[PDB]
Amino acid sequence: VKPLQVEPPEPVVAVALGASRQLTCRLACADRGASVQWRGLDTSLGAVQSDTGRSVLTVRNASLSAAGTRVCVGSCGGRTFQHTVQLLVYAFPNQLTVSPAALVPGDPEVACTAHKVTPVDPNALSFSLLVGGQELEGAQALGPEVQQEPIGGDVLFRVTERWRLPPLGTPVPPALYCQATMRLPGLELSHRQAIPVLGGENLYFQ
Structure with a gap:
């Protein structure tokens, strides 16, 4: 003993x-x-x-x-x-920014940025693009971009993933979601942010 x-x-x-x-x-x-x-x-x-x-x-x-x-x-x-x-x-990100904030027909890409995050190692921090509760098959990830984000006396990071979208099929989904997940010993953290998918006439209402 x-x-x-x-x-x-x-x-x-x-x-x-x-x-x-x-x-x-x-x-x-x-x-x-x-x-x-x-x-x-x-x-x-x-x-x-x-x-x-x-x-x-x-x-x-x-x-x-x-x-x-x-x-x-x-x-x-x-x-x-x-x-x-x-x-x-x-530091789990305290904000996830999506661009564009809403998708319309013809939009080819989604970007999702995690703010104030560390670690950024792909085995700990992962991004996924979801349709409903499943990952969207065929979304082509274009590689995370990592930039420094100084906060107080510590260097955190701002990390962006981008996806080239596949055909969304029919009926068109009401929304996609960006999710950032952090896996560490004993725990998994996630942040999911909705990306509405709008109709084909929205472009003409601007």
């Missing part, structure tokens, strides 16, 4: 930018002088070590700089125990 335990116990924990999270490190020790240390990968920022059986790490209003490896180290009866946990900090 291990005398050192951390709650939550998972080796990686995802925390949203601006959110809070605590890690509680407990050390069972029958002998006096037990100590618990929380630190980063090294101690260039300062390690905190206390004479205790319970030490809690709290990131508050998380910044991107909170991301990285944390280690709790316990000392009891001359032995050392450890637990390593990786904090991932992510």
Whole structure:
């Protein structure tokens, strides 16, 4: 049995930018002088070590700089125990812009832009173009464009996907949807934004 335990116990924990999270490190020790240390990968920022059986790490209003490896180290009866946990900090986009905002007959393309997002890695962040609740088959993705989006003291990103549309068939769907999805350890986040599809006379009502 291990005398050192951390709650939550998972080796990686995802925390949203601006959110809070605590890690509680407990050390069972029958002998006096037990100590618990929380630190980063090294101690260039300062390690905190206390004479205790319970030490809690709290990131508050998380910044991107909170991301990285944390280690709790316990000392009891001359032995050392450890637990390593990786904090991932992510910014799920707070806005998704679609262009054009509504489609009319003849429109060949949709663009969807996620604002203030990180990470942008395609294995974490994905875009899909839906018709009803299914992905639209044959929509040709033209590759994400990634630009920097500075917010406060952190660099987030603005990411645009574009699709060349296939024939929509008949009857024509009432709407398409852009969806941005972020997959991280233990969780999946999504944002779906409607794109109305209008009739063939709309162009003449401008």
